[PDB]
Amino acid sequence: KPWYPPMSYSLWRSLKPAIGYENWHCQTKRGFEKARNKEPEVQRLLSEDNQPQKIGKLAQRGVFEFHQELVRLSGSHGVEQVAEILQLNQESPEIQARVLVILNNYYQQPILLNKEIINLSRGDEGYPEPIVIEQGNYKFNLSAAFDCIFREADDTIHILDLKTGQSNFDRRQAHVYLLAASYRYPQEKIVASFYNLETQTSSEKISLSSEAIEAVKIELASLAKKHQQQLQKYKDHPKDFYHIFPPQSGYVCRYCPFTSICDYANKE
Ligand code: SF4
Ligand SMILES: [Mg+2]
C-alpha cells in the first residue's frame, strides 16, 4: 500500500475554476469536501446526493440495463421494465419525469447498440484503482471512472462519458480520461467524447498529442502538490480554516452543500 498524492477531475475542478466560471468557485467548498470531510456534519451533508446526481446515476444504470437484456430495446415494453429495474416508482415525481424522458430517449436511439462495447459501467462501482503517474520524480495517484469504453471500427479506443441535465462539457475531464486510458491501452489510439442522454447531444472527438499529455501531467502534478501543501497548512494551523481555503461568498452560496455550516455563507 504505497501512498501517493491523489488527483481526479473532481479535485482538478475543486482547485481551478474552469475558464468562464471563475465567480462560481469557492475554495472553502474544497476545504469542506477535503480536509474537513471527516467531521460528522460535513460527512452527513456530503452523503445526500442532489436530484441532478440521482438523475444521472439512474440514467447510467438505465443504459446498463438496456444492454444487459437486449430485448429491452427490441421489444415494445423495454423502457417500462427498465424503469421497474430502476425502481423509479420509489423516486420523487420530477425524478421520474426526467428519467422517463431519458429512458425513452435511449430507446428511440440506443447510441451504443451499433458499437463494440468494451465496458459499460452500472454507475455504482466507485473509483477504480488509481494509476501511478510519474512526472519528473513526483508520482501521484490518478483516479478516473469511465462511464463507457467502446472500440471503433478503426480499432480506436473511445471513452464516452454519459451526462444529463444542463451540465456542459469540461474538456479537462476528457483530458483526465485520455491520460488514464493511455495506461490501460498503451499501444492504441484513444479518443474521448461526451454525450448528454437528456438532450441527445454529443460532443466532438477529443484526442491528445504526446506534448499535450505531458502538459496535462505537469499541471496535475502541480495541483496535487498544492492540495497537499494546503492540507498540511490546515493541519499546522487548525484554527485558520477560512484563511487556507478562502471563501468567495454570494448568491452561489445558496447552492453549496455546506450553506448550513459555512460562516461566510451569504444568507440574503
Ligand atoms: S456557503 Fe458559499 S462561501 Fe461557504 S463554502 Fe459554500 S460556496 Fe463557499
Ligand atoms: Mg455520467
Short description:
By secondary structure, the chain is an alpha/beta fold. It has ten helices and eight strands. Strand 6, helix 8 (171-182) and strand 7 form a beta-alpha-beta unit.
How would you describe this protein?
This protein has a domain at 49-110. Helix content is 41%, strand content 14%. It has 10 helices and 8 strands. It has helices spanning 9-15, 27-33, 40-45, 51-68, 71-74, 78-85, 93-108, 171-182, 210-236, 241-244; strands spanning 6-7, 116-120, 131-135, 138-142, 148-151, 157-163, 190-196, 201-202. Strand 5 and strand 6 form a beta hairpin. The structure holds iron/sulfur cluster and magnesium ion (MG). The site of magnesium ion has 6 residues, from helix 4 and strand 6. Iron/sulfur cluster (SF4) binds next to helix 2. Residues 112-263 form the PD-(D/E)XK endonuclease-like domain. It comes from Microcystis aeruginosa (strain PCC 7806).
Layout: helices, strands, pairs:
Elements: E1 6-7, H1 9-15, H2 27-33, H3 40-45, H4 51-68, H5 71-74, H6 78-85, H7 93-108, E2 116-120, E3 131-135, E4 138-142, E5 148-151, E6 157-163, H8 171-182, E7 190-196, E8 201-202, H9 210-236, H10 241-244
Parallel strand pairs: 1-4, 6-7
Antiparallel strand pairs: 2-5, 3-4, 5-6, 7-8
The structure holds iron/sulfur cluster (SF4) and magnesium ion.
InterPro entries: PDDEXK-like_dom_sf, PDDEXK_AddAB-type
Protein name: Similar to tr|Q3MCC8|Q3MCC8_ANAVT Hypothetical protein
Domain PD-(D/E)XK endonuclease-like: 112-263
